[PDB]
Amino acid sequence: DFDDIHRKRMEKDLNELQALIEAHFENRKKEEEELVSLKDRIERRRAERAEQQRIRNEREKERQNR
């Protein structure tokens, strides 16, 4: 007894810390930069949609104005 405390504690004392650091690094890398880039891309597409909407609205208002 009291000799399995080492073999159940020291293991996770380093392996768990290193593995969780690895998980945090990979998750941040996968998540943050890709999300910001994708949001910028969607913003550019949204601006293009806004331009198309403005053009169509203006041309239809020009024709229909009677």
Next chain:
Amino acid sequence: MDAIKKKMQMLKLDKENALDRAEQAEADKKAAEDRSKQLEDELVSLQKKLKGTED
């Protein structure tokens, strides 16, 4: 978050174990040194008794 708390808990388990071992060792030193000094006093009294016997 998640892993950070567990790592802190590990760092705290090390804290408790190290501190407890230090305190126990300090108590051991106190007891052992008291033993040694009492033995030395007994030796001194034996020297004095030997001196009286020599007289």
Next chain:
Amino acid sequence: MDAIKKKMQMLKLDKENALDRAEQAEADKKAAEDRSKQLEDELVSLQKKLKGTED
């Protein structure tokens, strides 16, 4: 961040302090124990010479 660094460093410092204190205490314990053994060994011979003197 900020809190993680300071807390982790302080806790590791606590562990190291306790460990070194324990090592110093155990070293002094071993030295006192050996000196006590010397005191016992000399005291036995002191008793023997006292007994011869008394005879």
